[PDB]
Amino acid sequence: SGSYDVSSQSITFIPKQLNNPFSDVMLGGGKNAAGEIGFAEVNVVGPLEASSSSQVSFINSEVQAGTNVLVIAANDPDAVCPALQDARKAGTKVVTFDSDSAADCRDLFINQVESKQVAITMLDMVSDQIGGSGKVAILSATANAANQNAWIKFMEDEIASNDKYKGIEIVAKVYGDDDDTKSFQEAQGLLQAHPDLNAIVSPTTVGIAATARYLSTSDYKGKVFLTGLGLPNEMRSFVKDGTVKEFALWDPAQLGYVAAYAGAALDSGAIKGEVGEKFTAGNLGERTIGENKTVVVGDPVRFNADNIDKYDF
Numbered sequence: 364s365g366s367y368d369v370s371s372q373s374i375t376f377i378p379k380q381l382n383n384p385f386s387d388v389m390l391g392g393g394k395n396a397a398g399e400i401g402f403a404e405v406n407v408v409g410p411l412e413a414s415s416s417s418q419v420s421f422i423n424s425e426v427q428a429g430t431n432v433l434v435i436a437a438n439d440p441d442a443v444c445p446a447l448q449d450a451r452k453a454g455t456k457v458v459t460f461d462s463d464s465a466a467d468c469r470d471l472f473i474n475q476v477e478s479k480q481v482a483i484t485m486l487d488m489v490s491d492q493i494g495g496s497g498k499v500a501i502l503s504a505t506a507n508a509a510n511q512n513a514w515i516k517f518m519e520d521e522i523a524s525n526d527k528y529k530g531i532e533i534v535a536k537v538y539g540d541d542d543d544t545k546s547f548q549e550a551q552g553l554l555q556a557h558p559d560l561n562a563i564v565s566p567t568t569v570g571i572a573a574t575a576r577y578l579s580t581s582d583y584k585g586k587v588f589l590t591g592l593g594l595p596n597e598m599r600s601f602v603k604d605g606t607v608k609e610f611a612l613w614d615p616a617q618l619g620y621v622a623a624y625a626g627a628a629l630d631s632g633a634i635k636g637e638v639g640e641k642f643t644a645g646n647l648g649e650r651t652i653g654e655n656k657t658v659v660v661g662d663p664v665r666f667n668a669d670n671i672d673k674y675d676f
Contacts, residue, residue: 365642
């Protein structure tokens, strides 16, 4: 249990950058949770520009103000670390969400989704759409992208191991470099080199948007399936057209919600922040602290034509 007795305590949310549409949904969920808990002061401070050490001055400012709970989305895992370590020695409970810092600068980390689960969700959507077997191509971000290369590796391992995904044949691995013009050109060349393609997996919001724009304007509309990780606002039109049937991502509001309850649990004394401990995250139920003091919000949220108009990010 993650009890609430922080009626006199203060909570502050520091995003990567201020006034970011997707980041503001995460902050909104955090503020709503903090209100439910009953925090005395609920504040949102941060930089106007997302730079490695842009949050350092804001972390130090909150320590001077005597903030009890600090929820931060680290721009760089090492640059914000000395400021966050100074917060912990001052008595501030440091909770990281979305993007983590180093292991020794925070009391707890709240991750949206688990890496292997992202890969499983994508393979499940591919397998379901292609019909169990077919030629599939991957349109990733940059070649050196840490998150994408991790999801692709789990995907490749599951195809070789699990009998459920043995039918999925990866025939290409192209890189859009998180650029709309490059991702569009890569998708155009993908159908030129592989015209017998059944589907395209794009584990990038920029890549999936540019591939959807190409498929909807080409003869491959509805014929070549497109799935991966995307944004409801950008994908809305393509989901209704029939270019995209189902893609996945996550609800950022749930991440801020769990983080505010996690911080309240550490500050009240319900949890020490150890591996195996459990805390209540309001309406979302209980959560367990896993390895490297990490808490997972849940499985990736699947978006289709039945729930696309219910999310705005």
